[PDB]
């Protein structure tokens, strides 16, 4: 048993307070153990924000002066996080978890981008080689999915179907919108034979394309 | 509030080395209260070595743990695959409690190639004017790989994004993506372009290029 999961709005504007919850499954959050909320900053630097010990009283991280606030629901075995005047420095994966000893638990962290950027779809796009490819023992498909925000966006090849041989590469920001993409790779006979799709999901947007990638040649 | 300084920050490491990560603190704490964590990409980090020599359960013995006063090292005798990740030693005698910036660990292995792959605009774009030529460098180590954008035999550096993914888990390689990005127009207004790898493996740089012959 013991389980955490973050969760909250992954998107909050600059100058306002971020609130996130951790829920707590499988043991009380009273009947012992301090409750941490842990962050990761983008190039991975771990802070350490404060805790909301099993008796209810809360220690902070002194540098989140006065923008950190710890409370928990006994009822219902979550606590909370909320943070205030944030701004972009707060982007960060935000986990919340206990421990002592051989033992400790984590929850699977949430991501959360605090921007002022309005929210983009993106725009996926078949990569396909060009006419005439020779064709080796193998084809090299790929997947642009452009200029979209804010981050998490789920990229699989044939629901999920295609699974090895696929590369799946981290986005980039530029001029505040991500870019990314993902190559595919497959046997000559099986393309273009077998269907080949691309299945793109930006949450944030509602946005669910599906891109097949048709070829340019013969 | 103690500061922990972890060196080296990233370091590769042959199959079967021993490889010793250090931690020093600003000032004394509690060697009980220095744990170590080891964190593996899409995972948070799990505890690795608690009380500073303490494995913690599922930890393996070829790790260990050794320290007093300000500096704790993490020990592996013999690497291996899966112990590429990255080790943040923690501590909680002082408050507030710190993390040390981490240690990011790589995996050697057989030099290779990266297989190349260059890919013109899809027509979806064009048709908005943009204009992306992607290049895929797949498969390849070391990671040092240089990769050059030519167009008629000019080079351009500006408008490209390149991204590499982290050491794969299977074979230890990495992949690369360069985005050269141009409008409908420059693109237009060109021929042949040029995706040039300059890898530690092959002299002959791995060349793949396609022209705009509008098919
Ligand atoms: C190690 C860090 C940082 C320092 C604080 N703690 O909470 C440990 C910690 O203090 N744990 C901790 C502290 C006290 C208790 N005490 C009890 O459970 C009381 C039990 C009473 C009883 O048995 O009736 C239990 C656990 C965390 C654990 C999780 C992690 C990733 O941030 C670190």
């Given at each position: 048993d013991v389980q955490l999961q973050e969760s909250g709005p992954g998107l909050v504007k600059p100058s306002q307070s971020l609130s996130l919850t951790c829920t707590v499954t499988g043991y009380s959050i009273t009947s012992g153990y301090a409750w941490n909320w842990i962050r990761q900053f983008p190039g991975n630097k771990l802070e350490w924000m404060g805790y909301i010990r099993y008796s209810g009283d809360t220690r902070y991280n002194p540098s989140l002066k006065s923008r950190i606030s710890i409370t928990r629901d006994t009822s219902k075995n979550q606590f909370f996080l909320q943070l205030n005047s944030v701004t972009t420095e707060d982007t960060a994966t935000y986990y919340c978890a206990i421990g002592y000893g051989n033992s400790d638990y984590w929850g699977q962290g949430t991501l959360v981008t605090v921007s002022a950027a309005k929210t983009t779809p993106p725009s996926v796009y078949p990569l396909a080689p060009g006419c005439g490819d020779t064709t080796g023992s193998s084809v090299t498909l790929g997947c642009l999915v452009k200029g979209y925000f804010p981050?998490?966006?789920?990229?699989?090849?044939?629901?999920?179907?295609?699974?090895?041989?696929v590369h799946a590469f981290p986005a980039l920001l530029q001029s505040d919108l991500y870019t990314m993409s993902s190559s595919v790779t497959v046997p000559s006979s099986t393309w273009p034979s077998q269907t080949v799709t691309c299945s793109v999901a930006h949450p944030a947007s509602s946005t669910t394309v599906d891109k097949k990638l048709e070829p340019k040649d013969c | 509030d103690i500061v922990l300084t972890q060196s080296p920050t990233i370091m590769s490491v042959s199959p079967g080395e021993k490889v010793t990560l250090t931690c020093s603190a600003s000032s004394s704490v509690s060697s009980n209260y220095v744990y170590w964590y080891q964190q593996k990409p899409g995972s948070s980090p799990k505890v690795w070595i608690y009380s500073t020599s303490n494995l913690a359960s599922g930890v393996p013995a070829r790790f260990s743990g050794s320290g007093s006063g300000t500096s704790y090292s993490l020990?592996?005798?013999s690497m291996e695959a899966e112990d590429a990740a990255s080790y943040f030693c923690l501590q909680w005698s002082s408050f507030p409690y710190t993390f040390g910036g981490g240690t990011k660990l790589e995996l050697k292995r057989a030099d290779v190639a990266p297989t190349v792959s260059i890919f013109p605009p899809s027509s979806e774009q064009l048709t908005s004017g943009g204009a992306s030529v992607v290049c895929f460098l797949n498969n390849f180590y070391p990671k040092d790989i240089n990769v050059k954008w030519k167009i008629d035999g000019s080079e351009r550096q500006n408008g490209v994004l390149n991204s590499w993914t982290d050491q794969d888990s299977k074979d230890s390689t990495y992949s690369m993506s360069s985005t050269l990005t141009l409008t409908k127009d420059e693109y237009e207004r060109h021929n042949s372009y040029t995706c040039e790898a300059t890898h530690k493996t092959s002299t002959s740089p791995?060349?793949?290029?396609?022209?705009?012959?509008?098919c």
């Open positions: 981050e998490s966006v789920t990229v699989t090849w044939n629901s999920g179907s295609l699974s090895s041989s | 020990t592996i005798s791995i060349v793949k290029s396609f022209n705009r012959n509008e």
